[model samples]
Target: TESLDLEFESAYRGRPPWSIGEPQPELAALIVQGKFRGDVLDVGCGEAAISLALAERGHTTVGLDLSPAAVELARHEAAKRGLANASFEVADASSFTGYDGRFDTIVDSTLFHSMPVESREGYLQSIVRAAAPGASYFVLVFDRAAIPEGPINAVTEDELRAAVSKYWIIDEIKPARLYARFPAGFAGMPALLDIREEPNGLQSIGGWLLSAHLG
Candidate 1:
């Protein structure tokens, strides 16, 4: 009710913990420059910024989020822009028993580090089952090694290795930073950002970008 009221009354500044209402610059840049073909599945696709961008670039993209509001927002924005390649759905990241290994690529940002430790295994399994053989995948983590103290869940080296080994062949896990600007402008994010310093000392996310190939 509180979030909906804020959205309805134009009071939301996109500050909700789960709804950042924007895409991270690092993630966006990686997606744009990286080599990904065919279909994509964006897990925890908040507002579908990156996913929609991919669709605009000629890739078939399907973005799924647990929040119906978020999914609706993404769909509305895509339609308004006449982006015919994008699609959105409301779905749980912890369950993907419906999809096959058909996605050429799958991308996740910050979400991997946000899930509870107990749910991490299931969540990994969910995405893994949806992976096409040899599909490219990327995940951004709040590496505690980089930002000593923070609020976002920190991913341990051993923890990630174990989770990834289940269904992917490790490719690259290197130092990376994520920059977020809220409420995309007319050109939308990746191309433009609202350039403002974060006032809230929320866990500043900085860490490793993991790239892998489905094994």
Candidate 2:
């Protein structure tokens, strides 16, 4: 398999489709509902949009990504915004270390699906190591039911449950929505092209918002 770092570095060469430059509305709504509690770790935080948004709202946030380019961009944005509460790091999630029992909230946006199915256990274990007991964990990922096949991987409910059952007790799995901005005329799956795009070309997509807590 190709290294994830290289895959993401190439994406960051231009604007990454998933890097919408702002926190997704679904996550924002969660923030408004006070779902994100305590020090937050935004795993696989591409460009740190969610982390910066959380920091802006007075949450201490750490954003971690595998791609050096993405991490650098996240660091630059945090500096530009002068968000002392937000920090960025280049790291792999499957073996995340150095912060044992440190995080009280963890958010994985689109990262779970990106992980190879075989690595899911290690990924969840790494989070368990970092998260405090009872810490809340939230994941926003593409829903396989809504988009069976797409440019990126999506997860079935059974797959999602199997991956997290060992580490977290899921509270809810709700239908959610997210948007991605691709270059105009970008050749993606034909069905994806049929989706509605905003004036600026942000295409709406289906997702699942999972809420859980460390077991």
Candidate 3:
């Protein structure tokens, strides 16, 4: 209802960095491993890259985002690709409702860390209400160990565990890297730790891949 939400809405304009045109390579490999299944809900899905990937693999996916423009783009992409199983909607992650016990799998790629620490538990509860019993949950976030300071918040392993333990059983937290597009007409890259140019030409940011299941 204010500029903060507007800030996020504008972030999706013209693919600002994170909306790389494809799923992150690491996440794509996870898909190949059959990590996601059934009615999958991709929270904070920017342009539905990962959701479309899952849809291509024959999973029913719904991509949810707070940004209307992003959701519109995601819908367009799904239609363009002719993925009937993939859908997109606009909703705030922290307080979204009306899908209780609908999703069999919930995936949050780089959205957990962006939320305020105080509201982290609320976000978790909101998603849990939308998830079925024993539903699998996966979270991908920038590693605080590698990214000490940035505009977006980063998460540590301990912090993640502490926050998620309230509603889910711990499974595994694997070290992974996420790929994102660089700014248009960007000249050079920053000398950030664990950041490198991958063979796919996207910049890799160090992250943690957490897999768990609702208790």
Best lDDT among the predictions, by candidate number: 2
| Regions more than 4 Å wrong, model 2 | 146-151, 188-194, 198-201
| Residue-by-residue lDDT tens digits, candidate 3, 75-169 | 98888999999988898888899889999899998888776666677889999999988899988898998777555568888888888988899
Q: On residues 1-215, what C-alpha lDDT tens digit does candidate 1 reach at each position?
A: 01222242232223444344455656776666765667998887867777877887889889987667777788988998899888888877877567788788988877676555566778888888888888888887867654343334567667677777777888878777655433434235553322334555322345678888877
**Candidate 1 global lDDT:** 0.70
lDDT pick, better of 2 and 3? 2
- Which pairs clash in the backbone of model 2? none
Q: Write the per-residue lDDT of candidate 2 for residues 63-159, one digit (tens) a residue.
A: 8888888888998899999998998888889887988999999999888877666678888999999998899999999878666554456788777
Q: Judged by TM-score, which candidate is best? A: 2
Q: Candidate order by lDDT, highest to lowest?
A: 2, 3, 1
* Residue-pair clashes, model 1: 0
Give the candidates in order of TM-score, highest first. 2, 3, 1
**Model 1 TM-score, 2 decimals:** 0.75
User: Least accurate stretch of 10 residues (summed lDDT) in model 2?
Assistant: 187-196
lDDT for residue 10 in candidate 3, whole number 0-100? 81
Evaluate residue 169 in candidate 3 and report its C-alpha lDDT on the 0 to 100 scale.
91
